Ligand binder design. Structure first.
Ligand code: RIS
Ligand code: RIS
Ligand code: MG
Ligand code: MG
Ligand code: MG
Ligand code: MG
Ligand code: MG
Ligand code: MG
Lengths: 338, 338
């Protein structure tokens, strides 16, 4: 894989990221807490989002212009994307009352952390702009990158807002769980930061700043992002936690999941009442009841049929909109998620 | 007052700020939640930080260059400072387990809000960069302002980190509460965003971007910021909530307050044990015991003597470092806080 070939170097750059962010002795204790937050949260993942920056940079920039300093900036912008995601996940885990993430207990669930994690999450976000300034201040794409990361934060936060509004705690209303709402949540909430942001960063780094090029790129990447969140919802309930590294909470959290949307599209009036009585509640028995209904409506086969249809749809979109970028930029990402 | 003369216009500009931030129908519900967050949080205060931008702009820019569009940008950057503070306070109220703010219950304490306020706080932060782009994108000071707001967030977050580390819940250790630590907390945590940020924004807007000018300005403004946080700590316990609009929690929160620092400097071994047994705990009786010790050590008179010494010290600093800026830029702010 083109990701496996660049992974080792990317992960080894993390030490430099941390050292640079850790180097006024009065704030030494705060800096040690930042190091602890960085090391706990921005490490233990697959680093696919950050790697997508590095890989896309190598495919878009002329090898002659891929010098030691330009590669360093690519690895740094890659780590900036991982830091953005670390910021969102630390905060999303509090708001979703999650237990584990990347095989360990959620940072806020750690004794002595608690709601202090809210500030820790904001520090991770601040670190992006610290790194963009330290490594890209003198580059012509500097402001493009600042604006792209700020826009990515706004889009995700709007998406998280739709997510929380559609999922009110202890307010069970399935009328809100529609396909139109679902696609809107995921587009803003996941698709921009997970797929548009990494490729767009490498594009700007390669001097590709044209609105039309970014629009064409966005058409493919937002559609891949939608499949990716549908996969995330599927794995929340039917995935193996020893593989996902996290425990699913969508049913207990009354989330507008792809699965509840598909359940509602296929449920008889009798099945609708079962779901109405058991969804969005903490009881193990009620959550087990919902999973049984999903299994009875054969949603895992519906997801597998969707994964196939989605893949063929995204491939058709790469054929239509990849030009003038190398199709490999999008094919490498499509192989990693499908 | 130079603030009273510009207040009405500034507060009336809020409607335009909200309309511009509220104007893709799919995200309509999220936008209505953003409007609710803006209206609840960025309104009910004294708006002194945002007003400081407007007033300083008028004193630094040549009246001939103070056209309709430039004034609009000044009111917008002023509202951006209020939005930064709204972001910090919504999150600080969760982390400090506060009850009220600006005469109403804390946004997170509202039924149906809760930990969703974490995302609401991030949306308020995102709104700054939305406004800076909509109104200052074509201005030569655009990047200066972006960097100044991002640096302000980082500084405050580092300061909040020192604050939370020095105040561990249920871990009563007075050994941490030193004057060196106190000054470090407040400098990063309050002084940069409250006093440096507003004047620096107006300076950049007036084309004053010189490092030496910003350094001289910072020397006065960080010292004013220190007095202001000392005043905030004093009012936390001895202020009138019907005037402050908020209930104090520093004693129950085990905070490194200016008052606990002064108590420790003057306490006998016997008085140290009383404080050790009663500080950083929820019991009304224990909090009453701490306030009695502060009254016995005559800390309100120590604060009044400090307010006098501080004022004379800041005035001496305006004489030394105000040039070439009009001393009125700093005198107007000193009258508002002293
Ligand atoms: O990692 P998670 O919690 O499974 C998730 O994908 C995390 C996340 C955070 C922010 C934006 N998008 C996705 P969610 O949407 O809560 O299902
Ligand atoms: O408004 P508060 O809570 O009295 C305060 O001043 C708020 C605040 C928030 C962020 C940075 N600085 C001050 P604090 O420091 O918690 O005493
Ligand atoms: Mg989650
Ligand atoms: Mg979530
Ligand atoms: Mg999930
Ligand atoms: Mg507070
Ligand atoms: Mg606080
Ligand atoms: Mg206070």
């Amino acid at each position: 894989d083109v990701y496996a070939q660049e992974k080792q170097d990317f992960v080894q750059h993390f030490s430099q990221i941390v050292r640079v962010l850790t180097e006024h002795p009065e704030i030494g204790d705060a800096i040690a807490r930042l190091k602890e937050v960085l090391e706990y949260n921005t490490i233990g993942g697959k680093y696919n989002r950050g790697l997508t920056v590095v890989v896309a940079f190598r495919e878009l920039v002329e090898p002659r212009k891929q010098d030691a300093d330009s590669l360093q900036r690519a690895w740094t912008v890659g780590w900036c994307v991982e830091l953005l995601q670390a910021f969102f996940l630390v905060a999303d885990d509090i708001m979703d009352s999650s237990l584990t993430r990347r095989g360990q207990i959620c940072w806020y669930q750690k004794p002595g952390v608690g709601l202090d994690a809210i500030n820790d999450a904001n520090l991770l976000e601040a670190c992006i702009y610290r790194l963009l300034k330290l490594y890209c201040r003198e580059q012509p794409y500097y402001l493009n990158l600042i604006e792209l990361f700020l826009q990515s934060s706004y889009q995700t936060e709007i998406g998280q807002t739709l997510d929380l509004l559609t999922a009110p705690q202890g307010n069970v209303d399935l009328v809100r769980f529609t396909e139109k709402r679902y696609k809107s949540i995921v587009k803003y909430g996941t698709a921009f930061y997970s797929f548009y942001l990494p490729i767009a960063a490498a594009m700007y780094m390669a001097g590709i700043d044209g609105e039309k090029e970014h629009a064409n790129a966005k058409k493919i990447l937002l559609e891949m992002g939608e499949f990716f969140q549908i996969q995330d919802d599927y794995l929340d309930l039917f995935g193996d936690p020893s593989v996902t590294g996290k425990i699913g909470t969508d049913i207990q959290d009354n989330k507008c999941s792809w699965l509840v949307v598909q359940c509602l599209q296929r449920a008889t009036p009798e099945q609708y009442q079962i779901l109405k009585e058991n969804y969005g509640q903490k009881e193990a028995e009620k959550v087990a009841r919902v999973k049984a209904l999903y299994e009875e409506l054969d949603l895992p086969a519906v997801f597998l049929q969707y994964e196939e249809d989605s893949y063929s749809h995204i491939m058709a979109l790469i054929e239509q909109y990849a030009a003038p970028l190398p199709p490999a930029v999008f094919l490498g990402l499509a192989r990693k998620i499908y």
